[PDB]
C-alpha cells in the first residue's frame, strides 16, 4: 500500500472493491448467463480433461478479460504511474490463477464418484469387470493432474518475481530521499530487512485469504445439488437443507470459536518483544565503553525476560486442547452424518466419498488461521516500525 | 552440544548411541520376548483404548525405564554436572513420548478394518446391521482420540520448557566470561537472539528425524503380516514380498531422488546472504558519515543483489516439478497395486482401506525433508556464526 507501487493507495482499494462486487452480482444472480443464450452454451460438462475448453468455460475467460481490461484502462488514464503494468495486471493474473486451481480441485472431486462405484460393483460380483476399465479411470485422472502440475509451477515463478518487483519499488523510493531520512537511528536495518519481510508476508496472507473464500463459494452449489439424497440427519431429524447448514456451521463456527478462545495471545507476544528489546539495548551499551556490566542489573533484566516469558507457555494450553479436539473429531464428523442415510440405502459407495472429500477439502483449505499467527505478530510490528520510520 | 549443557559433548553422544543399539539388539531380534515367557504375557491385543494396560505393553514400559535408569546412573557417577537432570532425563522422556504417539497411530490404523467391513455389509445386505453397532464403533474411536489429545498437550508444554532451559544454560556460560568476550563486534546481538534460534531449531529437527525412523520401523511388520492377501503385483507378476518391497522403494527412492536433484540450492542461498550482508555494511558507513552515500556504488551493490538473486528463482522450477509430480502420482500409486487382486475379488473393503492408510501415513509422516530445509540455510549459518564468535 505504498506510493511507489499501486498507483494511489487511496481511492484505489475502494475502486477495486466496488467493481469486483458489481461484476459478481451481475454475473451470478442477475442472469448474465443469457450470454449463454447468445451462443450455443450446451451446459453439459464432461469429466475428462477436455473440460477446460468447452464453451461454458471459454465464455467466462473472455468475460474476465473484458472486465479487467476496462478497470485497467480507467486507472491508466485517470492518473498514470511508473509500475502500473505490474501493480494492476500482475495482481489480476494472480487472482485468476488461484481461481483456476480451485476449479481443478472441483474437477477431481467430481471424478471420485464413478471410480468407487466401479470398485463396489467389482467387489460384489467378480463376473462383471475387466482391468481395462480400471486403466482407463487412472488415465483420465492423470490427464487432469498434468495440467495441474504445469499451472502450479508457472504460478510460483511469477508470484516470486512480482514480490521482488515490489521490493525494488519501495527501495527506489526510500533511497531517492536519503538525506532527510539519513539521520533516523537504525535506518540501515529498515531499508535492508523491513521491505523484503513486509512484501513477502503481505503476499502470503492475502493469497491465503482469497483462496479460502473462493473455495467456499466454489463448493456450496455442489452440496446443494447433492443434498437431495440425504433427507434426515441423525438426531435433529429432518431438515430441508441438512448438509449445507451442517457444513457451514461446522466450518465457520470451528474457526470462529477457535480464534476467540485464543484472543489474549498477541498481547503477550508484544510484551515479550518489548522486554527482549530492552535487554538487548542495555547489552549494547556495555559493549563499547566503560564497565556498564552491573551483574545486579543483568540479573534483574533476565528475571524480567523470564517471568514474562513463562506466562506465554501457560496461557497456551487453553489454545491447544481446543485445536486438537476439533481436529480429531473432524476425522469422523464427516461420516457421522450418514448413518441413517446409509441404513435407508439411498447413498451408495461413491456418493459417500464425494461428501467425505468435500468436507475434507473445505477443512484443508480452511487451515490458514492456525498458521496466521505470523500476521498477528510480526506484520504489525513491521508496519508500525516502518511507518514510524517516516516523518 | 555445548559444554554447559550435556555433560561432555564428546563421549556422551557416542556412548548413548552404542547403548541404544545394544538395547535394541537385545530386545527386538535377540529374543527379549522371553521375559514374556516368565510372566503370563498372553500376547493377544484388544482394539479399544484398553490396549495400553495389558501386560504386552506394560512389560515394555518397565524395560524402557530400566535401560534409561542404568545409562543415566553411570553418567551421574562418572562426570557430575549442574543441568544433568534436564540434560539426561528430559531427553529420555521426549524420546519415549514420541514413540507413544506413534503407537496411537498404529491403533487407529488397526481400527479401520472392522468399521469398513461393517459398512460393506450394511450396503450389500441391509437386514444384518442395526444402527447401535455404528454408534459403538464411533464410541471406541473417540475412546482412543481422547488419550491422543491429552498426551499431545502435555508433551508440548514440556518440550517448550526444556528448550528454555537450554537457553538459560548457554546464556549463563557466555555472560560469566563477558570481559574477555567484551570487545568482539556485536556481542549483544549474538547473546540476545542466536542462543534461542539455535536451541529451538535443533530441537525441532532432532524430533522430526526420530519421528520418521520410528514410523517406518513400527509399520513394516504390519505390511509383512498383511502381504499374504495380495499375491500378484500389477505387472511384474508374483514376488515373495511384493508389498513391502514396493513400499520401501517408492518412499525411500522418492525422497532420495527429490533431495539429489535440488542439491545446488544451499550454495546459492548462502551467496545471496553474503552479498546482502555486504550491502548492509556498506550502507552502515553512510549512516553517520557524509561522503559514503555514493549513488553509483549503491547502484552497483543493488545490481549485485539483483543479478545474483534471480538464479535462485530459476533453479527452483527444477525442484518444484519433481516435488509436485511425486506428490500427485502418490495419490493413486497406493491403489494402483491392488487392481488384479480387486478384480479377482480376494480383498474385502477393509483391507483396501487399511493398506491405503498404511501408505498414506508413511508418506504423510515422511514430509519432513521437504519442510526440514532449514538445516541448509540458517542453522548452519547460526552454528558457524556463534562458534566463530567464540575464540
Amino acid at each position: 500500500m505504498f506510493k511507489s507501487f499501486f498507483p494511489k493507495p487511496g481511492t484505489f482499494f475502494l475502486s477495486a472493491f466496488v467493481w469486483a462486487l458489481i461484476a459478481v452480482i451481475f454475473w451470478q444472480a442477475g442472469g448474465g448467463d443469457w450470454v449463454a443464450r447468445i451462443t450455443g452454451a450446451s451446459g453439459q460438462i464432461p469429466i475428462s480433461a477436455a473440460r477446460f475448453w468447452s464453451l461454458d468455460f471459454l465464455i467466462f475467460y473472455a468475460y474476465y478479460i473484458v472486465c479487467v481490461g476496462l478497470f485497467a484502462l480507467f486507472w491508466f488514464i485517470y492518473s498514470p504511474h511508473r509500475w502500473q503494468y505490474w501493480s494492476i495486471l500482475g495482481t489480476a493474473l494472480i487472482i485468476f490463477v488461484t481461481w483456476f486451481l480451485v476449479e481443478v480441485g472441483v474437477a477431481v472431486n467430481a471424478w471420485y464418484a464413478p471410480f468407487y462405484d466401479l470398485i463396489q460393483t467389482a467387489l460384489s460380483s467378480p463376473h462383471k469387470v475387466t482391468i481395462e476399465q480400471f486403466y482407463r479411470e487412472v488415465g483420465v485422472f492423470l490427464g487432469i493432474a498434468l495440467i495441474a502440475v504445469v499451472i502450479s509451477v508457472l504460478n510460483n515463478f511469477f508470484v516470486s518475481h512480482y514480490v521482488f518487483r515490489w521490493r525494488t519499488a519501495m527501495n527506489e523510493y526510500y533511497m531517492a530521499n536519503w538525506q532527510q531520512l539519513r539521520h533516523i537511528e537504525g535506518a540501515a536495518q529498515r531499508v535492508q530487512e523491513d521491505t523484503m519481510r513486509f512484501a513477502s508476508t503481505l503476499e502470503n496472507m492475502g493469497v491465503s485469504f482469497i483462496n479460502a473464500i473462493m473455495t467456499l463459494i466454489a463448493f456450496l452449489p455442489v452440496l446443494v445439488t447433492l443434498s437431495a439424497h440425504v433427507p434426515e440427519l441423525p438426531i435433529i431429524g429432518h431438515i430441508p437443507y441438512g448438509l449445507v447448514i451442517a457444513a457451514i456451521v461446522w466450518s465457520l463456527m470451528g474457526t470462529g470459536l477457535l480464534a476467540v478462545v485464543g484472543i489474549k495471545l498477541p498481547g503477550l507476544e508484544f510484551k515479550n518483544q518489548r522486554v527482549e528489546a530492552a535487554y538487548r539495548k542495555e547489552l549494547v551499551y556495555g559493549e563499547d565503553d566503560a564497565t556498564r556490566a552491573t551483574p545486579p542489573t543483568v540479573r534483574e533484566l533476565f528475571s524480567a525476560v523470564r517471568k514474562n516469558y513463562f506466562r506465554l507457555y501457560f496461557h497456551y494450553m487453553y489454545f491447544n486442547i481446543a485445536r486438537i479436539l476439533y481436529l480429531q473429531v473432524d476425522n469422523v464428523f464427516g461420516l457421522f452424518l450418514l448413518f441413517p442415510s446409509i441404513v435407508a440405502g439411498t447413498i451408495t459407495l461413491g456418493l459417500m466419498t464425494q461428501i467425505t472429500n468435500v468436507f475434507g477439502q473445505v477443512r484443508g483449505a480452511f487451515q490458514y488461521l492456525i498458521n496466521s499467527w505470523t500476521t498477528l505478530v510480526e506484520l504489525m510490528s513491521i508496519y508500525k516500525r516502518l511507518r514510524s520510520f517516516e516523518h | 552440544m555445548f559444554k554447559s549443557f550435556f555433560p561432555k559433548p564428546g563421549t556422551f553422544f557416542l556412548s548413548a548411541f552404542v547403548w541404544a543399539l545394544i538395547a535394541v539388539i537385545f530386545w527386538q531380534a535377540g529374543g527379549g520376548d522371553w521375559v514374556a515367557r516368565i510372566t503370563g504375557a498372553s500376547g493377544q491385543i484388544p482394539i479399544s483404548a484398553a490396549r495400553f494396560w495389558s501386560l504386552d505393553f506394560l512389560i515394555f514400559y518397565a524395560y524402557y525405564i530400566v535401560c534409561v535408569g542404568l545409562f543415566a546412573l553411570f553418567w551421574f557417577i562418572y562426570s557430575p554436572h549442574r543441568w544433568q537432570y534436564w540434560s539426561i532425563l528430559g531427553t529420555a522422556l521426549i524420546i519415549f513420548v514420541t514413540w507413544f504417539l506413534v503407537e496411537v497411530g498404529v491403533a487407529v490404523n488397526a481400527w479401520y478394518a472392522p468399521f469398513y467391513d461393517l459398512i460393506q455389509t450394511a450396503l450389500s445386505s441391509p437386514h444384518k446391521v442395526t444402527i447401535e453397532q455404528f454408534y459403538r464403533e464411533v464410541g471406541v474411536f473417540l475412546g482412543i482420540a481422547l488419550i491422543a489429545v491429552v498426551i499431545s498437550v502435555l508433551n508440548n508444554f514440556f518440550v517448550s520448557h526444556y528448550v528454555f532451559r537450554w537457553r538459560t544454560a548457554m546464556n549463563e556460560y557466555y555472560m560469566a566470561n563477558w570481559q574477555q568476550l567484551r570487545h568482539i563486534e556485536g556481542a549483544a546481538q549474538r547473546v540476545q537472539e542466536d542462543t534461542m534460534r539455535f536451541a529451538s531449531t535443533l530441537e525441532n529437527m532432532g524430533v522430526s528425524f526420530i519421528n520418521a525412523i520410528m514410523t517406518l520401523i513400527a509399520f513394516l511388520p504390519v505390511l509383512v503380516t498383511l502381504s499374504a492377501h495380495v499375491p500378484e503385483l500389477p505387472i511384474i507378476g508374483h514376488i515373495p514380498y511384493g508389498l513391502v518391497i514396493a513400499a520401501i522403494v517408492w518412499s525411500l527412492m522418492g525422497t532420495g531422488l527429490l533431495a539429489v536433484v535440488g542439491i545446488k540450492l544451499p550454495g546459492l542461498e548462502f551467496k545471496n546472504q553474503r552479498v546482502e550482508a555486504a550491502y548492509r555494511k556498506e550502507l552502515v558507513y553512510g549512516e553517520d558519515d557524509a561522503t559514503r552515500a555514493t549513488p553509483p556504488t549503491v547502484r552497483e551493490l543493488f545490481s549485485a543483489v539483483r543479478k545474483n538473486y534471480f538464479r535462485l528463482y530459476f533453479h527452483y522450477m527444477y525442484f518444484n516439478i519433481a516435488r509436485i509430480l511425486y506428490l500427485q502420482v502418490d495419490n493413486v500409486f497406493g491403489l494402483f497395486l491392488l487392481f488384479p487382486s480387486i478384480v479377482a475379488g480376494t480383498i474385502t473393503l477393509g483391507l483396501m482401506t487399511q493398506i491405503t492408510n498404511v501408505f498414506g501415513q508413511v508418506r504423510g509422516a515422511f514430509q519432513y525433508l521437504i519442510n526440514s530445509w532449514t538445516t541448509l540455510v540458517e542453522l548452519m549459518s547460526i552454528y558457524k556464526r556463534l562458534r566463530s564468535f567464540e575464540h
Epitope: 441404513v343 435407508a344 440405502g345 439411498t346 451408495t348 | 441391509p126 437386514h127
Partner: antibody, heavy 120, light 107 residues
Framework: LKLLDSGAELVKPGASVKLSCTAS????????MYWVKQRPDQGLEWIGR????????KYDPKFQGKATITADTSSNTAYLQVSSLTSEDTAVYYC??????????????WGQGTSVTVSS | DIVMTQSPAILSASPGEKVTMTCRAS?????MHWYQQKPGSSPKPWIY???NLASGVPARFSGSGSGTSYSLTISRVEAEDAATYYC?????????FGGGTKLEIKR
Amino acid sequence: LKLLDSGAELVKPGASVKLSCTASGFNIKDTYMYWVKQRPDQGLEWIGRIDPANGNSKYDPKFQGKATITADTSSNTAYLQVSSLTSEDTAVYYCARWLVRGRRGTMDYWGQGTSVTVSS
Amino acid sequence: DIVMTQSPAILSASPGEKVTMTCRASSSVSYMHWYQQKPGSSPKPWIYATSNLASGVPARFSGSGSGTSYSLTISRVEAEDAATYYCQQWSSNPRTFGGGTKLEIKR
C-alpha cells in the same frame, strides 16, 4: 396388512407369463419383496428378491436367466416374469415381505399364491 | 449352499405330551426361523432368529440353540396342531429351506 396375488392362470408350453402382488397397508420402500415356489412335492424353493428403495436384485444361481423380478414403487407392486415354460413348471408362487427398516410386529407375511398349469 | 438336514421326518404325539424337532445346518448360520403350514394355506412364522417369538401366538411354542444345531419344543400339543413345520436359514444369498416333519395327533 394385505397382499393380493393374481388369479389362477393356464398357459401354453413355451410361452411366458407375468404375475403381480399388490401391497396395501404399508410402504414398500421399507421392505424386501421376495418370491417362493412350491412344487407338488411339498418342498419349498427360493427364487429371488429385490429391494425397492434403490432397485437391486439377487437371484438363485440355478434360476438365473429364467425368471426376472421387477418392482414399481409408484403403485405398490412387484412382478415376476417366467419364460420358456416346460412340463416342470406346475407349481404355486407366493410373494412375501421382510421388514428391514422400522422393525416391529410380524417380520414376515406371505401372500396367497397363484396356481400355474402348463399343458396342451 | 448350506444344506439343512431336518429330522425326524415323521412324528407323533398325544394331547398333554411334549415333542421336539431338530434342524441341523451344515456350517455356521446364526440366522434361522421356524414356520408352520396347515393344509391348503400359506406358511406363518413362529420364532424369529430362533429366540424371539413373533406376534401373538400361544406361548407353548419356543426353541433355542446356537452354532449349527437348533431345536423346537411344543409344550402341550393339542387338537389344533396338525401341520407341517419347515425351517429357513438366511445367512447367505441363496437361501435354503428345510424338509418338513408332518406332525400327527393320536386318539
